[PDB]
Amino acid sequence: QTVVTQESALTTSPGETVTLTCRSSTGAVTTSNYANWVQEKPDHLFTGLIVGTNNRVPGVPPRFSGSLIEDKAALTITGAQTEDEAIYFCALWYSNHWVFGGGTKLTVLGGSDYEFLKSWTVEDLQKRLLALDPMCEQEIEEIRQKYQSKRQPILDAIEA
Amino acid sequence: QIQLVQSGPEVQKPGETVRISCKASGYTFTTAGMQWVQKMPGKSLKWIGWINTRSGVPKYAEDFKGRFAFSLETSASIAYLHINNLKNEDTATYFCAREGPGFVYWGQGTLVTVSSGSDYEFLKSWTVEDLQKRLLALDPMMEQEIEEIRQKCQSKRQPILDAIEA
Amino acid sequence: RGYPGQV
Hints:
The structure holds three protein chains of three kinds. Chain B is α+β, with helices and mostly antiparallel strands. Chain B is 22% helix and 34% strand. In chain B, the strands form two sheets. In chain B, strands 2, 4, 5, 6, 9, 10 and 11 form a seven-stranded mixed sheet that branches. The longest helix of chain B has 27 residues, at 139-165. The radius of gyration of chain B is 20 Å and the shape is flat. Chain C is largely without helices or strands. At the A-B interface, strand 5, strand 9, strand 10 and helix 1 of A face strand 9, strand 10, strand 11, helix 1 and helix 2 of B. It is classed as immune system. The entry lists the keywords antibody fragment, Fv-clasp, immune system. It forms a trimeric assembly.
């Protein structure tokens, strides 16, 4: 069986280094497992960080770096920032299929939840702002549909 | 700036079909494969497969090849996920993610909700008044969930406004 | 044999 394990949770502080690991049930992680690290932030925002063990995705900050250490794949965050608080997944390739680990919840101590935004360009802030209402309308529609599903057996009975 | 934008949430009955779209921009669509991923709350992410956007050849995970199919509309830079003969347990969020190797640029996710495949024949033994009362009894909780989202979204909005305004 | 996906 191909099972990928990660730490459940880790805590760091701003400017410090934290290492996340990814272990394989089949033995040592090698190049041939093409380890991929992915970050999940709130409302299902996934961002690829590292591919092919150690290749940083363009536009990903250089504090993230991937390696192989002690038969595992590793994501090192050298100089953690408050905005790095997130769930980190690793995926490994096993000949003919990809397997995801369970994710590591990274907590960063101290800080203010949206302080990172002040350093953004006004263009990026405007894009974020304009994307918000549609996203929240999508989430409301997901609720309406969840309820439609709950309602459906009753509606079917009315309409029989 | 690379973006993948998926279609909106879909709600269907078991046995039906859904098609989810994933519109790619900011790179040449046919130069990297598109993967698909299934996620349910508190369960692991599962790889569904990929499609090669140059050759059109897909590769599927064993558990998905029976009912899931991938397609392309190359001229629109769209990849599609087709879920056939829906089961209640297909209820999940589906993501497109570009190669690679692996999962580099992600769509925002599409929630597919599948209504119950179970036996609700008993409800046809109820009066219309009692059916309507049950229906209306679901509204308060829905309205509360929506209210919580509207409040959460005002809480997400203010720190952005504060950053623009500082 | 490397990664067989389209990269």
